[PDB]
């Protein structure tokens, strides 16, 4: 009868979180998990309110009520077509200096902060000003988009595995250029689901060769 | 000054279609082009009212007003998680008979008929009854959930590429196992952008060996 609800965003998807449900899952079986669609800034609130327990999202948005547990830095590549400036965007990476003058696909459409204004920030902190932006409402749609042929995308490195055609995913040299992925948790929860979720995060994070910014 | 808005379902996004819309954004670059999330049923309306001129489905919604142009049949496919039924689940494909009591994950949300209607047909018209169904929002979701544990997914071939892990995508062996991809216009539309983007179409389906169902 004990439900566990995750607040998760989307490119999450395409990563390790389903595997470390997988597996939370096979070692609790009695644990009933309902996966909820929720940015990082929204699952603030969400938290707060007992609407979910544990928040997988990719921005350092902080709140004394909330613990946030750093797991993993991913690296951003900027999804392009794949005849889109052969010579100008070299495959061995960019600065963003480069597509500034690129029309640009923002994502999600969200409250926030969000992803997009995150991707902005990037820009901003260099000085910089990308020349056309548009929000679109989920990554897999802005990747549709770039190969529709509708510009440029940056996206976390796991996203490149995202089924769009035609497209190539170029390295961002930039040093800040990584999306943070963290578990959100409320500060005076004791519930065992977050040590048991955190084993599991260990787990498949071993598996896959990656060692999770914190030490269990 | 003129913009084709064209209407499609999300599952589109990881097949040949991103690639018809580069190539007619090539073609005729004058065009602006507004690509629409909507369903095949919605989409009905969307034509009829304007508020679309081209719509990318895959149901036999038909209506006197509307015209249905059959591209392609794609074989439908059973998402697995990759260690769910070794034995009874064999690669080489299975019948729906053998998977009626899975939890079945079906999509998307939206007004019906729709894929999920149109999956569990496939079952009625075989006299056969799935366990459990539930309506997930969109086909990636879905596919993350399979990933996840929470059952079994069936989609289209092109959705094999979608980047959830640790799936198997399954022949579906029974001989109504296809999903049409069709595009549909008002009857009485008599502008040149249907012939272009159908040229678009046979060029792209030559590049990639696939015979369109329609002769040019
Ligand atoms: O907006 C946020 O809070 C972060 C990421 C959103 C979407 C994604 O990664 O798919
Ligand atoms: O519901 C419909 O009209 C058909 C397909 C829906 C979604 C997809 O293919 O992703």
Redesign the interface.
């Known amino acids: 009868s004990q439900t566990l609800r995750i607040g998760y965003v989307?490119s999450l998807?395409?990563?390790?979180?389903?595997?470390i449900?997988?597996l939370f899952?096979?070692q609790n079986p009695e644990i009933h998990?309902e996966?909820i669609?929720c940015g990082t800034k929204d699952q603030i609130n969400a938290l707060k309110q007992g609407k979910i327990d544990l928040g997988f999202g990719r921005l350092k948005i902080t709140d004394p009520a909330i613990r946030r547990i750093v797991l993993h830095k991913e690296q951003l590549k900027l999804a392009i077509?794949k005849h889109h400036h052969p010579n100008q965007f070299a495959a061995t990476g960019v600065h963003l200096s480069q597509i500034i003058d690129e029309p640009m696909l923002l994502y999600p459409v969200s409250q926030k902060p969000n992803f997009a204004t995150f991707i902005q920030s990037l820009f901003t902190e260099l000085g910089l000003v990308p020349s056309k932006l548009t929000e679109i409402?989920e990554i897999?749609?802005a990747?549709?988009?770039v190969?529709?042929?509708?510009g440029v995308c940056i996206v976390p490195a796991?996203?490149?595995?995202?089924?769009?055609?035609?497209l190539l995913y170029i390295p961002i040299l930039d040093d800040d250029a990584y999306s943070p992925i963290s578990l959100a948790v409320r500060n005076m929860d004791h519930s065992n689901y977050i040590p048991k979720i955190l084993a599991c995060v260990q787990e498949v994070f071993a598996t896959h060769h990656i060692r999770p910014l914190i030490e269990s």
């Open positions: 989307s998807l395409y990563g390790l979180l389903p595997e449900i997988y899952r096979q998990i996966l669609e077509h409402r897999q749609l990747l549709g988009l190969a529709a042929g509708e796991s996203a490149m595995d995202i089924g769009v055609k035609n």
